[PDB]
Amino acid sequence: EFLRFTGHRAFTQRLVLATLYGRPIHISKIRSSSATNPGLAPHEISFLRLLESVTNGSIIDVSYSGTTITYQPGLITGTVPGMNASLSSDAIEHVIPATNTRGITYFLIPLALLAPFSKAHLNVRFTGPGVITSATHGARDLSIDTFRTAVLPLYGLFGIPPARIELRVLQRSCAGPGGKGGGGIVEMRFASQVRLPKTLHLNRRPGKVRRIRGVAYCTGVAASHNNRMITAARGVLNQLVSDVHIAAQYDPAPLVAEQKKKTGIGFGLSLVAETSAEGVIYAADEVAPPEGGVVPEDIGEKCAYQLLDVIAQGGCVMAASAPTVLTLMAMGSEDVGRLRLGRRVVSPELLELARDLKAFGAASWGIRDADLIVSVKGTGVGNVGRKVA
Amino acid sequence: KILKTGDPLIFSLGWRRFQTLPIYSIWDNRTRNRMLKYTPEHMHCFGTFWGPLIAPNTSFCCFQSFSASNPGFRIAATGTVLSVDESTEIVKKLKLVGTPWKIFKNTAFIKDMFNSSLEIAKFEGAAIRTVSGIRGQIKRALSKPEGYFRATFEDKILLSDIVILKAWYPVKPKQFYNPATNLIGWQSMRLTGEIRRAENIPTPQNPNSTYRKIERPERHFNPLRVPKNLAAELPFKSQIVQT
Amino acid sequence: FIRREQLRIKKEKDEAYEKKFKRIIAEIQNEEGRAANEYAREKAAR
């Protein structure tokens, strides 16, 4: 009830920083303008359910209008066998409903940056009708492949080792009828809980972009779609790079309940450019419209153009993974860590994250020239509960 | 002095001095976090209290009363903060104690344990045990005396035996928190001995609980009693000769 | 139902514990005995 926020922008960032700092928040006026569907969105209320499920002692209170919530956070326990599940290796089930338009990386990015600060492991299993493992048009969410091999190496940079991260899909799905729907189930297993993340330093220039590797996925369409997409993306990137290599993945169709239906018919592509210097990777994704039927070569050219855009633009980390690396840099020890952002990278979401950290109680950021070096002072919180044996 | 669970204790931990009342619990054999009733002499037990949260591996000291008229050694307990949590899992043994009513070869009827067939139907199939070591299982509620049941044991139990069922009842610590604001002034919660000496109530003592010396007579058993038909049917080389 | 669930959980938990600590004791004994035999070989050559 104490701290006060307004608006529906950066909602998951506000709740996750509230959980990590232990500061009780109160977010008012979610949808004041919308007369048709005011209040909380279904993906937002399902993220509230997931946050209650993985935490312990957190009290979430949604109002009668649905336009104001308050949130007194508790500790991030994870899957302990006395409170959350029955066994320590058991996956906590989470179902998200059929009226869900955002991708599953909308749930995975806050959970993956809230997961190294837990007590036990995290073994979340996202099932249900509305679990889209693809990119959305939506708010342009990342795919599962983009999310995995673009942002989990950043935890590898921080010292949360990716030897113990297990993000695996069991079915894959796109949106289907309109934006709503899904069907493809995932499970994420964080077994690498750290006390304090390392204060990293991204300062040297990530000049030579050495190679491009990627994933083109097709669920419900012909398997020549990814071959045509690979020929389009190679026709764009062969002017620049000799080694572009894009895996092809194909799944038949996922079935949801109504008597089951096959939903999530679509196809998309996800390129990742690896710089020879360090853990610096630029990613881009593009998905078919869930009703449109556009050319796969158009999609391959579109994702290659977005990848060359991000390679032109980015200093060290792209703006999709910049809030995650900046909030982990803030969670680290009481030293300064230095990120090298591009001047084009700075975004209203990044700026809103800065405003939220200043409101919560972290120190401000120091911006100097080198693209600009942003330097963040850690707050030294870490994780609160861990059994020091 | 030893220091009891439930009795308050002034913890010096962080910058905070705070009087809280803890729960002492051993980690039984790394299984269940069983609640003790006193701290063990010369042994680290776990404690659990409701205070401010501190990052673990933080050492602490622990006093009983900030008085100058203590004749010896004011500091009581030491240690280090193990972890922090909400809603701990402390567990205390509750033994439902009963008495045999009718004793057959294996199935014995057990009387003074439950009060109704609803309670027996809840505790159906439970691992019941004799004091002697005979295991057994609660089988079926008994109809005509309300509150008795049938339990099939391992071997024959005796009418002198006591039949226990060892359940684990959870114990939650209390959420009390005194700040030890000494420069302003503060109310110090007393200990149970000071409370009893002040308001004049004796300590509860059970005569069935106080240990005694047991006079065991030497166990002599009856001789073998061979039945008449078997003793008349077995052959000549092994026939029983009794004058 | 609680009987069947608790017996399944007890079997799975005991099997996982036995497997994990057999691995741990075997790895510790392997590394320590390897270094001890290497030191006994390097000491007997002097």
């Binding site: 935490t55 312990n56 002692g57 957190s58 979430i60 109002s63 409170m83 029955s86 | - | 609680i2 669930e5």
Partner: peptide
């Protein structure tokens, strides 16, 4: 119901959804 309560024996706090 029963297995879920046996899993969340000691789990404090939850999302209070008034809508």
């Amino acid at each position: 119901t029963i297995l879920v309560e046996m899993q969340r024996r000691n789990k404090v706090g939850g999302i209070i959804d008034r809508r």
